[PDB]
Point group: C2
Chain length 327, copies 2
């Protein structure tokens, strides 16, 4: 079967993740471009050994049950096979990360249905069936392509209390995908998921503000030791924007207000407190686009991407450092 | 507790409509339903279902003078009043989805922020209800994804009791009568009785058992059906089959509802939904797709019920 502690059972193979997310938001036209190959090749100069191939599925509202995927403008299955194979050809292990977004712009963490099944109303059973179709489609692609890990959800905060349905989904994923399973909880939520034992590896979105990282190392260490599972950050990063380090999760904050040093300071602090601890298994950073801006435009770019910015050198020196390279 | 023979007036609560000459004519016409109560209903607004800030009494919403007018006009017509302030969401999301994380997270909106804003909204109107002598205050409507916040609901009710001495209800949604754990904190239980054609005998049995488990008075704070094709299958769905007129669908809904819910000693009647501040012309009624019964067959079902042997006695 599957239940295990600090190491996933051998049949599913823990590696220290030195990663960068690639491809968000998952647009077929961007992934099919020439430019996509150049972008992924450049990403390898971060001295990463993993990438999360990340792309969206879509539902209309936070309270609608039906998820669409693999229809324009979203990635085709061939686009996904290409990205996985390209990453493996560059020496990377792959986390496949299908993420549901909401067409009306609502953050997916608010996706939610009534606790009670009411006749005229959308139900959890309807949404889980649609979510299962989406995730099992990509679990089968992950198996076919040899992805080392599958992330079965991201920041789905207002679904996490649905423990029986998450465990049922996981059992269905295990029947079609034989690699490592993680679930990416949101910032601050590491001790709030009741079903961590059903996945192989715990992970979170480590969007902790400047000045908090020492506190969160102590907090997360205790949580991870209580669960006896490997843990890593499935997202971590900061836009190169004025004050972004106070709310590094806020992708809409202070657009166009450039601050290279804010991003650099965020990364220096994060690596100062989360490095080689034996209970900790590293970083899947956020993020790197399929269409990468020119190097000459980097100093005026406001994105999470570190290409051409001082934070990139903090990342490379951390990932190539012996203390990390020995893990 | 009175037996409520009621119609809701004033929704959605637009100052310009309520200050019109037409508003007085509308409310006077409503009295010909042989009602003895009205719910004066109007909106407050928040931006999204996960926004903490509620705005009220700012254009285009009702002024406090407009609310004092509607309550006094209703009382001058011999009606007891339920004051019903209802939060809506500017993006169109149904208020039943208003919700926040169970965990307080630093960068995120919190239940404490939303309940502080909701308290300011509801206490403003609770004080207006006290000042104007409203017989009842409805402290929320169909707030399904806030009902589990039991301590915060009880805390809000304790504040409301300090400023309002009349009857308090909370209006739960359809099918939710057994799901609210804090019914004891209000005086009267109530729900949105949007039960489909063919289900009323079942729901009478279901609701009787719930009400007898609590040993409190119960009535419907909303009940009604648009005069539209197949609206009786989903009488809550205010957006269903717009412009597809069916006067008989609405009549059949009302006949069934009154067949099963009438004079039971545990049951305290109906606040029907709804009647606008600006009422269409009688000659336009047969082509009107609203919940309003004015000029339609269902109005005669309602009048004959509210004046009937079994009901006039309660």
């Amino acid at each position: 079967h599957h239940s295990s502690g600090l190491v996933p059972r051998g049949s599913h193979m823990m590696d220290y993740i030195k990663g960068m997310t690639w491809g968000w938001i998952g647009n077929s036209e961007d992934w099919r471009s020439n430019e996509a190959e150049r972008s992924m090749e450049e990403m390898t100069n971060l001295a990463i050994n993993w990438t999360a191939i990340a792309f969206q599925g879509l539902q209309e509202t936070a309270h609608s049950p039906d998820i669409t995927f693999a229809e324009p403008p979203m990635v085709t299955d061939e686009n996904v096979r290409w990205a996985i194979a390209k990453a493996k050809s560059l020496g990377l292990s792959v986390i496949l990360k299908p993420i549901v977004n909401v067409r009306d712009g609502t953050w997916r963490a608010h996706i939610n249905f009534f606790d009670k099944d009411v006749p005229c109303e959308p139900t959890w059973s309807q949404w889980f069936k649609s979510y299962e179709s989406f995730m099992l489609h990509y679990a089968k692609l992950a198996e076919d392509t040899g992805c080392e890990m599958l992330c079965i959800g991201c920041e789905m905060v207002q679904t996490e209390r649905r423990e029986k349905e998450w465990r049922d989904l996981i059992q269905k994923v295990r029947q079609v995908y034989s690699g490592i399973i993680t679930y990416n909880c949101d910032k601050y939520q590491e001790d709030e998921v009741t079903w961590w034992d059903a996945v192989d590896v715990m992970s979170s979105s480590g969007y902790y503000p400047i000045g908090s990282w020492e506190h969160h190392e102590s907090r997360i260490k205790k949580i991870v030791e209580s669960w006896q599972k490997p843990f890593f950050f499935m997202e971590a990063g900061c836009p190169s924007r004025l004050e972004s380090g106070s709310v590094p999760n806020d992708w809409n904050k202070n657009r166009g207000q450039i601050d290279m040093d804010e991003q650099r300071v965020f990364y220096e602090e994060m690596f100062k407190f989360f490095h080689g601890q034996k209970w900790f298994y590293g970083f899947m950073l956020w993020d790197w686009p399929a269409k990468l801006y020119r190097l000459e435009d980097a100093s005026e770019n406001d994105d999470y991407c570190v290409y051409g910015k001082p934070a990139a050198e903090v990342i490379k020196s951390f990932f190539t450092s012996n203390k990390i390279a020995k893990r």
